Amino acid sequence: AQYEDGKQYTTLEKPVAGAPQVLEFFSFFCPHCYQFEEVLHISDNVKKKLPEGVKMTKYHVNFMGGDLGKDLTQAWAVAMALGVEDKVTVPLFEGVQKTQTIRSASDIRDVFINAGIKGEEYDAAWNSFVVKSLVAQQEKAAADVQLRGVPAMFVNGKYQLNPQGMDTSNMDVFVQQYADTVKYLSEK
């Protein structure tokens, strides 16, 4: 077959029930995730190939960056609660990996302030129990699939993308086949 279990994707031994249709995990400390987001724009290219209105979920992970890595998961929960993901994704990636000016929770907060999020607005969400639940959601999702590495993408909580089975000769070709695989899986 053109698509085969173990080539472009893998099947989860224990399927996860009720998971998001398309769920990808990432870390602002993850170098591959930087390439995925800023150079390849994988998520946006996957979204453009799925049926309009499909649910695309993106969660941060804890297992990179120790203390800061957990602050970034809470900061991503803040971004999700306020709906400012598209405003802080770039500066956070570059703050951590390009300029390396993000070394504390306050430095993370600076990115939101510079992005236009009001100070009181950010601090209220940071300490809100809505955000604490969003943090638990992200952790539960990663735990459900026994996530040990990022970047990663799962489809309907049963199939896991295998980026190792694609050609990296061409930036655009790699993205296209990745997105086509997600489409194929979502139609399974």
Ligand X SMILES: COc1cccc(-c2ccc3c(CC(=O)O)c(-c4cccc(C(=O)O)c4)oc3c2)c1
17-45 per-residue burial string, b: 16 or more CB within 10 A, e: under 16: eebbbbbbbbbbbbeebbebbeebebbeb
Size of the site for ligand X (CB under 6 A): 12
| Contacts of residue 18, Cβ cutoff 8 Å, sequence gap at least 6 | 157
Token reading at 115? 């992005």
Q: How many CB atoms lie within 10 A of CB 142?
A: 21
Q: Which of 131, 113, 180, 154 is nearest to 26 (CA)?
A: 154
Q: Does 168 interact with ligand X (rule: CB under 6 A)?
A: yes
Q: By CB under 6 A, is residue 6 in contact with ligand X? A: no
**CA–CA distance, 21 with 122 (Å, rounded to integer):** 29
Q: Which is nearer to ligand X, 72 or 161 (CB)?
A: 161
Closer CB to ligand X, residue 137 or residue 176?
Answer: 176
Q: Which of residues 29-58 bind ligand X (CB under 6 A)?
A: 32, 35, 39-40
Q: By CB under 6 A, is residue 151 in contact with ligand X? A: yes
- Region from 21-29, 49-57, 129-137, 161-169 binding ligand X, contact rule CB under 6 A: 161-169
> Minimum distance between the CB of residue 52 and ligand X, rounded to whole angstroms?
26
Give min distance, CB of 151 to ligand X, in A.
Answer: 4
The binding site for ligand X (CB under 6 A) comprises 32, 35, 39-40, 149, 151, 163-164, 168, 170-171, 174
